[PDB]
Amino acid sequence: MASLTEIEHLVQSVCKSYRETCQLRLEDLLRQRSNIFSREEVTGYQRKSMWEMWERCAHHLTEAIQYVVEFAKRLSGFMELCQNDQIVLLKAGAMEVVLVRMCRAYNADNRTVFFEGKYGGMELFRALGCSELISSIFDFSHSLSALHFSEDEIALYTALVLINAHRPGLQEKRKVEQLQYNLELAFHHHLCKTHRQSILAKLPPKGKLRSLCSQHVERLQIFQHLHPIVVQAAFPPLYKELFSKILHRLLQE
Numbered sequence: 496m497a498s499l500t501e502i503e504h505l506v507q508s509v510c511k512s513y514r515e516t517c518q519l520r521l522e523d524l525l526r527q528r529s530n531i532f533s534r535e536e537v538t539g540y541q542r543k544s545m546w547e548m549w550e551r552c553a554h555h556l557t558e559a560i561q562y563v564v565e566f567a568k569r570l571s572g573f574m575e576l577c578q579n580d581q582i583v584l585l586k587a588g589a590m591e592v593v594l595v596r597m598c599r600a601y602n603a604d605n606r607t608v609f610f611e612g613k614y615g616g617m618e619l620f621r622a623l624g625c626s627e628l629i630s631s632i633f634d635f636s637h638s639l640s641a642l643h644f645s646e647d648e649i650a651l652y653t654a655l656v657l658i659n660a661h662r663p664g665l666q667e668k669r670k671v672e673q674l675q676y677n678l679e680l681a682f683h684h685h686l687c688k689t690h691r692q693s694i695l696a697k698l699p700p701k702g703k704l705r706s707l708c709s710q711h712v713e714r715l716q717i718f719q720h721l722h723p724i725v726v727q728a729a730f731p732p733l734y735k736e737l738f739s740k741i742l743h744r745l746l747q748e
């Protein structure tokens with residue numbers, strides 16, 4: 496199964512699907528690198544209530560997840576899997592894909608991230624009350640930024656983050672294994688062709704992405720225990736379904 500010409504066709508198909516479903520083009524994020532939050536704007540964010548900052552972040556993550564769902568729908572073989580398997584994969588990998596895509600909005604020179612039109616450091620998120628999680632996200636983004644990923648590398652890498660045949664709950668495991676294997680060949684083929692196989696040993700262990708998503712679910716539970724009505728009344732329905740049935744509807748479009 497799958498010859499060399501079919502693997503190269505898969506490479507281009509994945510890259511195209513990724514370009515079409517980017518929340519912001521890479522150049523839009525680079526051109527904004529000198530637009531940094533002033534000391535006064537940072538204090539403004541710090542002084543916001545914990546629940547207002549949590550609602551803002553849950554709204555931005557929901558928007559980013561919506562682009563990830565669209566990327567999955569454009570991925571060759573994804574819409575062919577059963578609906579149970581599509582939902583199992585999006586439920587475990589959607590936040591993981593948002594976290595890898597986050598490195599494009601991260602500036603390693605000054606340790607800032609793009610958020611609401613400008614760049615700011617970790618201290619912008621102090622009001623969330625989950626400094627360890629933000630810190631882990633910034634470290635993960637910094638570690639990814641040290642690899643100097645091209646857009647095509649991110650497309651192939653995030654396709655593999657999403658198409659994981661080890662997710663518990665998968666009914667047609669072999670069908671996901673075949674698609675994962677084809678995407679692995681496409682990723683390794685593209686790395687070999689462009690003299691970039693050296694990044695393979697430097698890719699983060701799979702347990703690191705799982706650790707960030709687990710910390711996110713735990714910090715959300717702490718916040719939801721303190722503010723149940725805020726989550727119920729002001730958090731996006733899709734965010735609550737993933738982390739706290741919108742997905743079936745999003746998938747049928």
Ligand SMILES: COc1ccc(Oc2c(Cl)cc(NC(=O)Cc3cccnc3)cc2Cl)cc1C(C)C
Binds near residue numbers: 556596611
């Ligand atoms: C996994 O959990 C979390 C993850 C992140 C987080 O705060 C953010 C958010 Cl919401 C957005 C951005 N940047 C962006 O969304 C910037 C962006 C915009 C458009 C295209 N690419 C990137 C940066 C950060 Cl650090 C908080 C939590 C939890 C604590 C709620």
